[PDB]
Structures are given as C-alpha cells and as structure tokens.
C-alpha cells in the first residue's frame, strides 16, 4: 500500500500449516502472493535476516490471529492445547556466527 | 470470537515480526529456515 | 559576521510542492501533539485564559493564511538547501506514493530514522546556517537596542550541545521526513577531474620546486 509503515511499524504475519506443509505470509492484514509448500517432516525455524538502519531493528511477536494456534502451542508438547500465547525461557534468539 | 473447537482441531501456527519505523524494510527479510 | 546564503533570488521547483504540503501537514500534526498534550481544546473562539484554540481542524481545513506560518520556514529551509546547490532527486517510490494519493492526529516517529555520515555533515551545515540566520536577527535587534550582548552570539562551533539541541533537531528532522517521503538528496557539486597522475600536485614536487627557485635566487644574490 505504501506509507502504511511510517505511522506504525509494518507487521509480516507468518502462518504455517503443519498438516499440509503450506507456508503463507500475511502483511498488514492482507495475504501476500508468495507461498511455499514444503515436504513432510520438515523442521522449520522462525528466522529474520536484517541489516540495521536504526538503533532498533525488529521485534519477534509471538501472538496469534483468528483461527490460528500460537507458536508456543506447536513448539512445546505440553502447550499443545493452550490458546494463550507463551514465551518459555527455552525459546531465545540465535544468530549466525 | 475464535472457534474453540477449531483451535483444538487445527494445526496452523502463527508468529509475527514488527519492523520498527525508521528501519528500512528492504533490508529486512522474514520467514522460515531449516 | 553572520552571512547565510541569500535565497531571495532562487525559487523552489514546483515538483517539491507535494513535499512542502506534506511537511506543513506534519508540522501542524506535531503542533497538535503538543497542543493536546498541554490540554488546549478545539473551539471556534480563540481564548488564552480559557485555553481554547480553533486550530485543531485538520491541515486541509486550516485557512490559507494559517498555512503560511508552516510552509514559510519550510520555504526558507528548502531554498537554503537548494541555494547550496544540493541536487534533490525524486525516487520511483515517492512516485508510487503520489500515484496512491473527531480529529485524531498522529505523527510519524523519527526516533529510529537515521542519517548517514555525509547526511550528518549536510545537516550540521544547514543547522549552522539556520543558527547564523537567527544570529543576524538577534544582532540587528542587539545594535538596534545599542547593547545587551546575548550570551549565545558565539559561533556555532563555540556553541554547546544543549544550545545546539533545538537547531540540530530541526535541521535533522526535516531531512528525516525528506528521506521517509523518499526524496533523494545528495551533494550539490560534482568532481570535474582529479589529475592524480600529475607529479606536480604532489606536495613534495611543489615544495622542491620552491626550494629550487629559492636556492637559485640565493645563488644569484651571492653572485652579485
């Protein structure tokens, strides 16, 4: 759309269908055209590549949208049926070194 | 209101990334890696 | 002796009129921020004791003379930047932006927007120029009153960070909004040719040539 990020930071939403392997992305509440289909048993790590043009770069948000499970519910086995989003201490940001 | 039964039978998971205003979006990539 | 580069002769291009309007809107918007934060309220009657002011109508609803106070400093800033020759270019992104193109105002946060090294140098130069403008007005007032040397009349270089704060923030935020709008601003002058292989322009060559001339002159003086 343009000019929709200066007012409020842009939000890409990543949804993964573990039952079908369909990777689709939504940005600013509208689905993007690009989609990825992965093969079964694929282990996918959330990842962000960024070159910093600011003191603050980005922010991992672990919320949920309508009709979708939070990320912790898929990451952890004990939280498989817990709609409340969670960020347990095991989860942490890693970087290539 | 989200359907509680759909949330229990579903396998779709979500996370989002906020690029703070002032950071160039062309320099930021979001998605999944193996 | 303060001399800003005179901008009366130079005129703004018509293509930058979109930016002029948009930054006038953004300045009105930050003014709405401070107005609402202080607690003034919208009302057709303008009272200072009642703490009410009608200028919470949007920028389009503002009067033409009301818009003057905003785009005026904008006009001087741009004519100052252009009188220095700094070529301002206009990217495809803003072209998409122009093609794209109960009062709840909301500004654009410039906290994370950042400039480059060279852009910082340019912002510092335009900032000191604005400060010399203020210096000329203060000095005309000063020997209009005869005396009263103002403490901040010292050069911009002599100024301190706290004194430089508001000048610097203005001179930077204008460039920040220019960048986020997408205008391409760079240096005005361009190199014509550097005669790098020229041995002459090496300092040693000129030094030794001058030494040769001096030694030969001294030789003639001792011969006579």
Task: Briefly say what this structure is.
The PDB classes it as membrane protein. This is part of a larger assembly, with three copies of chain A. Chain A has 97 residues and is mainly beta.
Explain the overall architecture.
The structure is cut from a larger assembly and holds 3 copies of chain A. The first copy, chain A, contains 1 helix and 6 strands, in the order ββββββα. Chain A is mainly beta. In chain A, strands 1-2-3 form a 3-stranded antiparallel sheet, with no helix packed on it. In chain A, strand 1 and strand 2 form a beta hairpin. The A-B interface holds A 5-19, 23, 25, 36, 42-54, 56-71, 73-74, 81, 83 and B 2-4, 6-8, 10-25, 27-34.
Largest protein interface, residues of each chain: A-B, 51 and 30 residues
What is the strand tally of chain A? 6
**Widest sheet of chain A: strand order?**
1-2-3
Q: Helix segment count of chain A?
A: 1
Helix content of chain A: under 10%
PDB class: membrane protein
Keywords: calcium channel, membrane protein
Entry title: Structure of PKA phosphorylated human RyR2-R420W in the primed state
Chains A, B, C: Ryanodine receptor 2
């Amino acid at each position: 759309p343009g000019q929709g990020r200066n007012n409020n930071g842009l939000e890409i939403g990543c949804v993964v269908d573990a039952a079908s392997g369909l990777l689709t992305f939504i940005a600013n509440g509208k689905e993007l055209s690009t989609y990825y289909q992965v093969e079964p048993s694929t282990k996918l790590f959330p990842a962000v590549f960024a070159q910093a043009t600011s003191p603050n770069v980005f922010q991992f948000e672990l919320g949920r949208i309508k009709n979708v499970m939070p990320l912790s519910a898929g990451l952890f086995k004990s939280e498989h049926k817990n709609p409340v989003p969670q960020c347990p201490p095991r989860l942490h940001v890693q970087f290539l070194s | 209101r989200d359907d509680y039964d759909f949330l229990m039978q579903t396998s779709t998971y979500y996370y989002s990334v906020r690029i703070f205003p002032g950071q160039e979006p062309a320099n930021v990539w979001v998605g999944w890696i193996t | 002796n303060p001399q800003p580069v005179d901008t009366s002769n130079i005129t703004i291009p018509e293509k930058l009129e979109y930016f002029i309007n948009k930054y006038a809107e953004h300045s009105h918007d930050k003014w709405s921020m401070d107005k609402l934060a202080n607690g003034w309220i919208y009302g057709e009657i303008y009272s200072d004791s009642s703490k009410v002011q009608p200028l919470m109508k949007p920028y389009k609803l503002l009067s033409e003379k009301e818009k003057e106070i905003y785009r005026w400093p904008i006009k001087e800033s741009l004519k100052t930047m252009l009188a220095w020759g700094w070529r301002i270019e206009r990217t495809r992104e803003g072209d998409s932006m122009a093609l794209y193109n109960g009062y709840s105002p909301r500004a654009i946060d410039m906290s994370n927007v950042t400039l480059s090294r060279d852009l910082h140098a340019m912002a510092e130069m335009m900032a000191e120029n604005y400060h010399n403008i203020w210096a000329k007005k203060k000095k005309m007032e000063l020997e209009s009153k005869g005396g009263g040397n103002h403490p901040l009349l010292v050069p911009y270089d002599t100024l301190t960070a706290k004194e430089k704060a508001k000048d610097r923030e203005k001179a930077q935020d204008i460039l920040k909004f220019l960048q986020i709008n997408g205008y391409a601003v760079s240096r005005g002058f361009k190199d014509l040719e550097l005669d790098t292989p020229s041995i002459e322009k090496r300092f040693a060559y000129s030094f030794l040539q001058q030494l040769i001339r001096y030694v030969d002159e001294a030789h003639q003086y001792i011969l006579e």
